Design a binder for this molecule. Structure first.
Ligand SMILES: *[C@@H]1O[C@H](CO)[C@@H](O[C@@H]2O[C@H](CO)[C@@H](O[C@@H]3O[C@H](CO[C@H]4O[C@H](CO[C@H]5O[C@H](CO)[C@@H](O)[C@H](O)[C@@H]5O)[C@@H](O)[C@H](O[C@H]5O[C@H](CO)[C@@H](O)[C@H](O)[C@@H]5O)[C@@H]4O)[C@@H](O)[C@H](O)[C@@H]3O)[C@H](O)[C@H]2NC(C)=O)[C@H](O)[C@H]1NC(C)=O
Ligand SMILES: *[C@@H]1O[C@H](CO)[C@@H](O[C@@H]2O[C@H](CO)[C@@H](O[C@@H]3O[C@H](CO)[C@@H](O)[C@H](O[C@H]4O[C@H](CO)[C@@H](O)[C@H](O)[C@@H]4O)[C@@H]3O)[C@H](O)[C@H]2NC(C)=O)[C@H](O)[C@H]1NC(C)=O
Ligand SMILES: *[C@@H]1O[C@H](CO)[C@@H](O[C@@H]2O[C@H](CO)[C@@H](O)[C@H](O)[C@H]2NC(C)=O)[C@H](O)[C@H]1NC(C)=O
Ligand SMILES: [Cl-]
Ligand SMILES: [Cl-]
Length: 310
């Protein structure tokens, strides 16, 4: 089959059908089945039917970023067993992706879902993608991080989740990520992290948690991070008292580079780095919940265990 209109087809280095920066409001008909690389970025494609791309059995790279995508059929990528790169980024209209869209893509190693406005990550959305190494989910509308979302992503090295409305980190949210190298979770709403949440992140070297809503960090949370060399806890409402003691001992016994850990409370130790603080500064308590040692024994029950010291 000859090359379709408003397109350029060539064979070197791979059989490529290139139709970018056109006025195409949909996928052009007549794309050669021999295509290994398809470039349809910079257009105005609204929908991606299931019939399209099926002919291209040998398709390895597919670019559909910077379009007007709003609805992708669940069987659109059926038959593309050799698909390696899939870029669907910069599609703010694409608010939701059907959980069975990526089934069968066992060769996919890079996936772009950034700047799409994804509200949620559907159950089984990343099931069976055991070859995925780069997953871009940054700058979406994600406001939840469900357990076992990346359970099958054992080869994943880069996971970008920054720029979302993610409120907390459940225990099994990052389970299965044994080969994770960099984890970017900055500019979210993270205020709570489970003690055994980084259970499998032993090979993690980079962890970005800055610009969040964290007030404290448990004792067992940073324990499994044996390979961590870069850590950033900038821009967080840290509370510097007895509850910050397990974090302080960790920051002290840490060789890798880490950003500043600015205190927010109490005002006495405000703006100072928890790193440089001494063991004496980490006693008593600071104001939490209702603003105010005139608290009753019942009232201090709503305070940390160390904070309840007599
Ligand atoms: C990152 O992703 C990796 C994949 O991208 C993943 O690697 C996968 O690991 C899993 C382990 O859970 C493997 O699953 C296993 O698959 C094998 C398949 O058989 C394998 O070994 C046979 C050996 O055959 C022998 O006998 C034949 C005679 O028939 C001889 O010729 C041969 O020389 C041997 O003596 C081999 O033939 C298989 O080859 C496959 O691929 C060729 C194409 O190259 C096909 O033509 C062939 O038919 C066959 O399908 C294959 O190597 C299975 O038997 C086990 O039970 C188990 O299910 C995956 O295969 C493996 N995928 C790879 C390597 O691509 C990594 O695990 C992942 N990383 C992390 C951390 O999760
Ligand atoms: C995806 O990739 C696979 C694997 O690379 C590929 O299967 C292969 O297709 C090519 C070409 O279609 C095959 O090579 C040809 O073999 C046929 C017979 O098998 C020959 O007829 C060809 O020789 C000439 O004849 C043609 C006209 O009769 C000429 O037009 C042509 O230019 C040649 O001069 C040619 O050598 C190859 O045998 C298979 N199999 C393998 C294992 O490579 C498949 O086609 C690709 N595309 C899709 C959609 O699957
Ligand atoms: C950061 O987290 C705090 C909770 O620690 C959020 O504020 C709380 O809001 C609830 C009501 O939903 C109150 O009961 C709490 O007393 C509030 N706590 C504090 C410390 O204000 C706050 O909204 C979060 N901020 C962001 C930007 O997500
Ligand atoms: Cl990449
Ligand atoms: Cl506590």
């Amino acid at each position: 089959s000859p090359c379709p209109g408003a397109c350029v087809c060539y064979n070197e280095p791979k059989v490529t059908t290139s139709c970018p920066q056109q006025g195409l409001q949909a996928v052009p008909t007549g794309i050669p089945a021999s295509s290994q690389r398809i470039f349809l970025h910079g257009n105005r494609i609204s929908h991606v039917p299931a019939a399209s791309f099926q002919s291209c059995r040998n398709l390895t790279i597919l670019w559909l970023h910077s379009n007007a995508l709003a609805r992708i059929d669940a069987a659109a990528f059926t038959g593309l067993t050799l698909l390696e790169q899939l870029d669907l980024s910069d599609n703010a209209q694409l608010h939701v992706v059907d959980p069975t869209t990526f089934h069968g893509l066992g060769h996919l190693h890079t996936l772009h879902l950034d700047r799409c406005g994804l509200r949620e990550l559907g159950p089984g959305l990343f099931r069976g993608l055991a070859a995925l190494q780069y997953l871009y989910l940054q700058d979406n509308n994600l406001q939840a991080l469900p357990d076992n979302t990346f359970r099958d992503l054992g080869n994943l090295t880069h996971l970008f989740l920054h720029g979302n409305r993610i409120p907390s980190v459940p225990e099994h949210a990052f389970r299965g990520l044994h080969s994770l190298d960099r984890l970017l979770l900055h500019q979210n709403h993270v205020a709570r992290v489970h003690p055994h949440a980084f259970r499998d992140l032993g090979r993690l070297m980079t962890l970005y948690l800055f610009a969040n809503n964290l007030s404290m960090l448990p004792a067992e949370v940073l324990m499994p991070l044996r390979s961590l060399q870069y850590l950033r806890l900038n821009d967080n409402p840290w509370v510097c008292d007895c509850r910050a003691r397990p974090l302080w001992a960790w920051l002290q016994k840490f060789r890798g580079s880490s950003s500043e850990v600015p205190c927010n409370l109490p005002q006495r130790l405000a703006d100072r780095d928890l790193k440089r603080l001494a063991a004496s500064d980490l006693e008593g308590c600071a104001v939490a919940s209702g603003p105010f040692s005139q608290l009753t024994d019942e009232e201090l029950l709503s305070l940390p265990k160390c904070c309840q010291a007599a």
